[PDB]
Amino acid sequence: MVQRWLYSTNAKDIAVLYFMLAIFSGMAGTAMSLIIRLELAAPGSQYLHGNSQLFNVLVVGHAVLMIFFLVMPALIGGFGNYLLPLMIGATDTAFPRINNIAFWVLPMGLVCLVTSTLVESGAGTGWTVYPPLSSIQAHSGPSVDLAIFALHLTSISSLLGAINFIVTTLNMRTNGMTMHKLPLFVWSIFITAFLLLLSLPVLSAGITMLLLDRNFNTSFFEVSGGGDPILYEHLFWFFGHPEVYILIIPGFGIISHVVSTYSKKPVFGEISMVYAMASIGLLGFLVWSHHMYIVGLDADTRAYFTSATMIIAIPTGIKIFSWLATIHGGSIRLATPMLYAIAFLFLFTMGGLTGVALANASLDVAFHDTYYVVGHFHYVLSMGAIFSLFAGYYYWSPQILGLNYNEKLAQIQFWLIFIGANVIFFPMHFLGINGMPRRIPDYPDAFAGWNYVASIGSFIATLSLFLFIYILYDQLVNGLNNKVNNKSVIYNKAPDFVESNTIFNLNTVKSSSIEFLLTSPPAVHSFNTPAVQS
């Protein structure tokens, strides 16, 4: 009905809408990656005739669709909207009517982005829209103007969503849930919302400065007029480095919850975990210019930014070890979410070691703007944030939807995506150390070796995505039959050693959150009488 979906006020329906928009944009953005790989498979322009445009435009579309339209609406708008009220114990959000406008301004941004792509110019500027190239003299069409308007819409959506989560967490908790006793996912969402609140306005200021400079004649970054194109870099990256932490902090809560349910032992040192999670968010505001090492800064500020960025590894490492200490003694259940979590623990540590290798300003003069950095951030994004998204889906979907998903057909998808992504993103570090630059459509012949191998691996991941789509179809259709036959696994916690099969069937869920105690699917009005803790 129109009223239920066009006039939505229920938070769960808004979460479903966020999910539904994320998959469509996810499929749209992962086909541009396929075309990019097909264009980079061999030297020479093979598929796109000679157009260097429509290559940069495709890269911009891919990056924006993957970041601002898949991970943001799924981790924050999809999981955050559906699960934070339930684990806290609130019936819905504090501002239920702006929660709808936090979503409905996203489809308008898609229209602005598509119509920007369809205008004769296009926006071939990168996701970092630097002023002098995206000025009015070099990009003379209305294309990047429409691209900027999409960023404003996403920013306003994220800001209004972030204000909602801070007030919801602070004064809508149940009768026993002191701020000291919270689930870790809620803590991650809280810290992420606080980072967004303090980081978005600076991006808005810089982006509006760029718009006014292109159309209102303000020497904001115009060289002829005293403007500085490097001020834009400061303004943008002040939102940029903290941003790489909005996309991973809610990814930490998912892993924290997954590894302590299929390993039947609670997390080792939770208070240190929340301390480390807050320290990464707080201290990420002091390291933004490591993205600006070679721009010509002073020698002494480079030393400061080199010393401050390595401190990031102290709390981060604490999270890596404390994850390896909560699985040491317990009993391990190797299911699909556990396989995703175990893969995450390895691939994210492989990404972080390369990251600390990049943190030294004296060495970054050899690894900047190469495929080395691409290989780096594709480990923490395509293997660090995507994997926790798959793990979260396989973790909560049977509880949310009420439909099981044929385990053995999902482990095949896991192995395919594992060995497909490792093929794409491991050879990149070899291309980067020989000096292969970024953002080029065609490369010298000597680089043709690992590029072919990486192009072969993209088809494996695309096949895994197609298999995942089929898994979705087989879950929605005849998914009620999956828990009748022996295709799926019903219980996420096996009985203990001295626990009989007839006593496990009176205490089925031994969980530390309200999420798994609710009916499947959860009711529209979940909490009439408030729940009591401790």
């Binding site: 490792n422 491991f426 050879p427 070899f430 070796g449 690992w450 191998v453």
Partner: protein, 36 residues
């Protein structure tokens, strides 16, 4: 404790060296089989 731990520990280091050599050493196979 030397007798018990030996039966389980030392075989795993050999299995250890195999898997890690696969995840990290796979591109060596492609180059040798036919760098051509």
């Amino acid at each position: 404790w030397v007798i018990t731990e030996g039966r389980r520990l030392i075989p795993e280091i050999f299995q250890w060296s195999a898997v890690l050599s696969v995840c990290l050493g796979w591109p060596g196979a492609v180059y040798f089989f036919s760098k051509a």
